[PDB]
């Protein structure tokens, strides 16, 4: 009641291959041709990808900056406040980026910083200016 293992026989298949005198030869040819269709499309995306790979010779090895190993302070120098504001007009709410700019401030004090200096540094206005960009 089930075909033998390895054999592939469904209803749908069979009229397709019996429907005329050479419907078998035709059906095998379409698969045979569509098989070249795809082999060349492989050669051709091998070639495309082979060129793109050569443009990436050496990756980004010459463009890497050493690692800043910096212990995270708690006090805000007048300097670090000023980097902060500028980071906000350039980054908006991405606290991870902002901390990376200041360097020695973690994301939480960065959050605390927005609320703490909200009126003296017009943090609200700065975000509006960042929003229109």
């Amino acid at each position: 009641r089930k075909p033998p293992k390895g054999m592939f026989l469904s209803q749908e298949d069979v009229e397709a291959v019996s429907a005329n005198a050479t419907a078998a030869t035709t059906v095998l040819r379409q698969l045979d041709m569509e098989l070249v269709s795809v082999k060349r499309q492989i050669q051709n995306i091998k070639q495309t990808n082979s060129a793109l790979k050569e443009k990436l010779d050496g990756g980004i090895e010459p463009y890497r900056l050493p690692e800043v190993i910096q212990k995270c302070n708690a006090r805000w120098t007048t300097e670090e406040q000023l980097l902060a504001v500028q980071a906000i007009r350039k980054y908006g709410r991405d606290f991870q980026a902002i901390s990376d700019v200041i360097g020695n401030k973690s994301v939480v004090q960065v959050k605390n910083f927005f609320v703490n200096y909200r009126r003296r540094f017009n943090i609200d206005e700065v975000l509006q200016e960042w929003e229109a960009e």
Partner: protein
């Protein structure tokens, strides 16, 4: 099986149920209490046993009663009925037995039997056994029919039936105790040797053979599960269905290849878009770097917006540098799936040209089994007789299978060289008109109560008729005759002085070059003790080799043999014989096959007797006068010797029932 139950199996009867035949003769018992049924059944089985455990002497009723025990031997008439039924229908006291009770001096009734093949002989003996006058007419100068045996010196080789297909339930078993048949087992191992002259490696022999068998199951699936039995108003053949199954396996291989390479392109286009995203990132990075080192070349001390620029560009560069690293990890992965996918491609082909040629030999073998091209076999029904296969090893007959008909022919009135040429049957009797095969002018008239026709189906098929029926056979009989298949098979006998082959190899194959010539000399037999190799010609080759001279045919076998064994080991054969069964006019073929468009019901149609019209209009309906037997008439055992024999036994019991009466049905 063992005991009385074993006897039922050896008689092809269920031990625990009564058959349709017995229900007809004992309608009292089958319709009655289940207890009496078991009584009967035991009585049957134990009588069968007695006959079977010694079949060289007649089993008289008294003798059966003595061995029978109570309470089974109480009802003396039940035992007389049972014994008489078995005797009539040839389940006991058939073959070549010595009589206790000598024949009644006066015979009753006259029967003419056309043909002294096995089916003819087996009826003739039964009818004589029953007290009738029997005469057989035989076109040939010999008995046996399609049991032919070559004899010259100590060379012995069957041109016809040669194998006893297993003794489990085979009536030839009984015959083998009655005749000196040297029954030699068959070593089933067969080395294939391809057209070069060298073995097919056991790697390849086994997986082609396994594909062959799988291709068969597949056609059966097509037949029974998907009802693929009619195409363009014509019934589907087996060969067609095999092509369809092969194509769909060739189609599947191509389909697998496409889905494989298609998931390569899918993943090498992910790679393409990954690389583009990595060019366009390496350029941002090459640029922000420039911007960063420019903003660093501004030496300190600098105002906070200058300081912010250096820090901002540094943060952005390390960000873009992290993205490009994540992409490199992703590129490495996908770059590895392409390596594995390329390394794991699916099968290139379904079957190679060398592989299909081996497959071709397994088809030639199957064409030999059925004596016909697989395009003629009915897909639905070609194997309808497998469920009655006998158990046990197949055997050959080392002293020649003709030993059997000749044995049966002993004591019978047989007119040889007598070609029946017209059969006349009427409400009052029959006349058979035959001529002498040597001088066809000399003419004979035989008159009888009944004719038993065992003309081979090929003869009945002949147009214009070789035998004329008067009146003509009814449409339902003639149409069965056209529908049925009558195949062809031929053998070449090669006689040698010296075994120059592997003597522990009974049979070995030769693989043909083409599909077309797949059956030409594709199998070789050494079964005989002496130096005799025997070569088969099956399928479409059979019909065509008959138009080729024996010297050319022997030539091709020598060439095939020379390649498998070397050009020096093959001596010229002394005696050569080549059968041409389709050309023989007393056969016109080898044996029947279930043609596409036929079925097993046609074999039953062939077995029906013919009843002529009333001589005087308004006279009462007459008795059947024309009866048929032979291998083409036994649905469950066609195209075999045991089948012909059983069909003879069948009609002799039926003719006797009609002309002598059945007194055991009360």
């Amino acid at each position: 099986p063992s005991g009385v139950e074993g006897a039922a199996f050896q008689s092809r009867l269920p031990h625990d149920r009564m058959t349709s035949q017995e229900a007809a003769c004992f309608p009292d018992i089958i319709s009655g209490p289940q207890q009496t049924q078991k009584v009967f059944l035991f009585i049957r089985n134990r009588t069968l046993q007695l006959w079977l455990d010694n079949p060289k002497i007649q089993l008289t009723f008294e003798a059966t009663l003595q061995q029978l025990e109570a309470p089974y031997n109480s009802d003396t008439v039940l035992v007389h009925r049972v014994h008489s039924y078995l005797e009539r229908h040839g389940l006991i006291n058939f073959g070549i037995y010595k009589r206790i009770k000598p024949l009644p001096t006066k015979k009753t009734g006259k029967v003419i039997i056309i043909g002294s093949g096995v089916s003819g002989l087996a009826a003739a003996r039964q009818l004589q056994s029953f007290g009738m006058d029997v005469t057989l007419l035989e076109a040939r100068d010999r008995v046996g029919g399609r049991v032919a045996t070559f004899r010259k010196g100590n060379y012995v080789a069957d041109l016809g039936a040669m194998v006893v297909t297993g003794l489990g339930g085979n009536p030839m078993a009984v015959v083998s105790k009655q005749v000196n048949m040297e029954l030699a087992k068959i070593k089933q191992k067969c080395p294939l040797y391809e057209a070069n002259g060298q073995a097919v490696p056991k790697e390849k022999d086994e997986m082609v053979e396994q594909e062959f068998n799988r291709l068969l199951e597949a056609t059966s699936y097509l037949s029974h599960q998907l009802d693929f039995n009619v195409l363009n108003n014509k019934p589907v053949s087996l060969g067609q269905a095999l092509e369809v199954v092969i194509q769909l396996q060739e189609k599947h291989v191509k389909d697998e290849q496409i889905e494989h390479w298609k998931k390569i392109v899918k993943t090498q286009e992910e790679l393409k878009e990954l690389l583009n995203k990595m060019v366009n990132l390496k350029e941002k990075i090459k640029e922000l770097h420039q911007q960063y080192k420019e903003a660093s070349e501004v030496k300190p001390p600098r105002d906070i917006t200058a300081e912010f620029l250096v820090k901002s560009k540094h943060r952005d560069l390390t960000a873009l540098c992290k993205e490009y690293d994540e992409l490199a990890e992703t590129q490495g992965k996908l770059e590895e799936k392409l390596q594995e996918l390329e390394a794991n491609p699916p099968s290139d082909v379904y079957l190679s040209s060398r592989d299909r040629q081996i497959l071709d030999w397994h088809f030639a073998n199957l064409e030999f089994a059925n004596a016909t091209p697989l395009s003629t076999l009915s897909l639905k029904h070609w194997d309808q007789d497998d469920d009655f296969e006998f158990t046990g090893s197949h055997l050959t007959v080392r002293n020649g299978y003709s030993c059997v008909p000749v044995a049966l022919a002993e004591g019978l009135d047989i007119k040889l060289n007598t070609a029946v040429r017209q059969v006349r049957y009427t409400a009052s009797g029959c006349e058979v008109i035959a001529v002498n095969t040597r001088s066809t002018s000399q003419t004979f008239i035989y008159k009888c109560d009944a004719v038993l026709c065992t003309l081979p189906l090929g003869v009945l098929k002949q147009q214009p008729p070789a035998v004329q029926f008067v009146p003509p056979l009814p449409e339902w009989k003639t149409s069965a005759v056209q529908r049925m298949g009558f195949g062809n098979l031929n053998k070449v006998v090669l006689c040698f002085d010296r075994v120059f082959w592997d003597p522990s190899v009974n049979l070995f194959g030769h693989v043909g070059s083409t599909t077309a010539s797949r059956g030409e000399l594709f199998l070789f037999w050494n079964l005989y003790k002496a130096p005799i190799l025997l070569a088969l010609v099956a399928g479409e080759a059979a019909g065509i080799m008959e138009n080729i001279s024996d010297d050319v045919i022997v030539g091709r076998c020598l060439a095939i043999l020379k390649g498998i064994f070397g050009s020096s080991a093959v001596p010229q054969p002394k005696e050569t014989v080549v059968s041409r069964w389709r050309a023989d006019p007393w056969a016109r073929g080898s044996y029947s096959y279930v043609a596409a468009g036929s079925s097993g019901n046609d074999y039953d149609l062939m077995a029906q007797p013919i009843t002529p019209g009333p001589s005087i209009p308004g006279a009462p309906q007459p008795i059947p006068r024309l009866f048929f037997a032979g291998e083409h008439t036994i649905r469950n055992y066609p195209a075999t010797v045991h089948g012909a024999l059983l069909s003879g036994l069948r009609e002799a019991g039926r003719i006797a029932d009609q002309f002598l009466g059945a007194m055991y049905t009360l």
